Design a binder for this molecule. Structure first.
Ligand SMILES: CC(=O)N[C@@H]1[C@@H](O)[C@H](O)[C@@H](CO[C@@H]2O[C@@H](C)[C@@H](O)[C@@H](O)[C@@H]2O)O[C@H]1NC(=O)C[C@H](N)C(=O)O
Length: 294
């Protein structure tokens, strides 16, 4: 209720009230910003990470791996400080593929070396932590390497580090995945990719994790419509009937969830089927923040 009804960017009094909101108890909002859709990357893009709503908790930098040096420069020099001004945390996402890369020794030294290399994606940009995207099962050697890397990262990020920086586990699999069973003690938040998913399933998936976390570490994710993308149908009209809305309102039985996240937050409000790039006032984000913290 200290959050703008449009996407205004507070400056003084209006700002401090948003900072103090974020310092206190709330269901948090996170969003994956597709780096290749930032105005500072290539051309033709309409949305910039500077547009992101003041009442957002975490912004994920999600590169595809071809983004121009302009974007990274902009991120370091411009976007991170501005987003830090609004009390918005900025977190680099990387695929689990990076943590099981066989170019890196499957040894203690190898795990540290790989962690150090991944920590440069955080430190070199003044980021608030690292998000590992886990969407695949692992063999015994891949598991051993990924676990080692998590344990090394845990010295600088997440609940074991004492730095206040985040180590985030984002996945479309459940809490029986061996990697989760090995690294759950290192994890700040666990974000469940729940695009197109039955509301009837949310408790079942949550139950798989609940013994390893508090409810406040758990987030569920819906997708915005990606240009030429999968039709998850998470953002159908009317809004207050959408899967996204149902996610904001959903609570595990007996407890309160940590919040929700959007994939492709740069596509906030673009209709399902509209494959053009457009600007956004982040209506859906700000509305869903309000629907969680009334
Ligand atoms: C091969 C492929 O397209 N994989 C994508 C993957 O790259 C996406 O990030 C992923 C995100 O969604 C999550 O995983 C799936 C498996 C479900 O469990 C979702 O509910 C999760 O949020 O999705 C993959 N794409 C698909 O699964 C699309 C699917 N084949 C379809 O056409 O409906």
């Amino acid at each position: 209720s200290v959050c703008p009804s449009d996407n205004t960017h507070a400056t003084g009094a209006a700002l401090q009230k948003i900072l103090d909101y974020k310092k206190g108890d709330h269901q948090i909002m996170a969003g994956y910003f597709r780096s290749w859709r930032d105005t500072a990357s290539g051309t033709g893009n309409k949305v910039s990470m500077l547009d992101l709503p003041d009442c957002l908790d975490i912004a994920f930098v999600f590169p595809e791996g071809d983004e121009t040096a302009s974007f990274w420069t902009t991120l370091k020099d411009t976007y991170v400080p501005a987003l830090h001004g609004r009390g918005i945390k900025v977190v680099r996402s990387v695929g689990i593929a990076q943590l099981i890369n066989t170019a890196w020794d499957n040894t203690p030294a190898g795990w540290q070396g790989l962690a150090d290399a991944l920590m440069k994606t955080v430190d070199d940009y003044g980021l608030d932590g690292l998000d590992i995207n886990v969407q695949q099962s692992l063999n015994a050697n891949q598991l051993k390497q990924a676990t080692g890397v998590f344990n090394a990262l845990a010295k600088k990020l997440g609940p074991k580090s004492g730095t206040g920086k985040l180590l985030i586990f984002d996945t479309n699999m459940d809490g029986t995945q061996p990697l989760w069973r090995n690294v759950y003690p290192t994890i700040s938040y666990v974000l469940i990719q729940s695009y197109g998913r039955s509301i009837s399933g949310l408790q079942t998936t949550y139950n798989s994790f609940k013994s390893y976390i508090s409810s406040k570490q758990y987030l569920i994710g819906f997708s915005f419509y990606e240009e030429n993308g999968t039709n998850w149908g998470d953002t159908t009209t009317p809004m207050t009937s959408s899967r996204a809305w149902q996610y904001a309102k959903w609570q595990p039985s007996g407890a309160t969830k940590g919040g929700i996240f959007s994939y492709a937050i740069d596509r906030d409000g673009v209709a399902i089927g509209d494959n053009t790039l457009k600007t956004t006032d982040f209506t859906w984000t700000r509305q869903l923040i309000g629907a969680m913290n009334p």
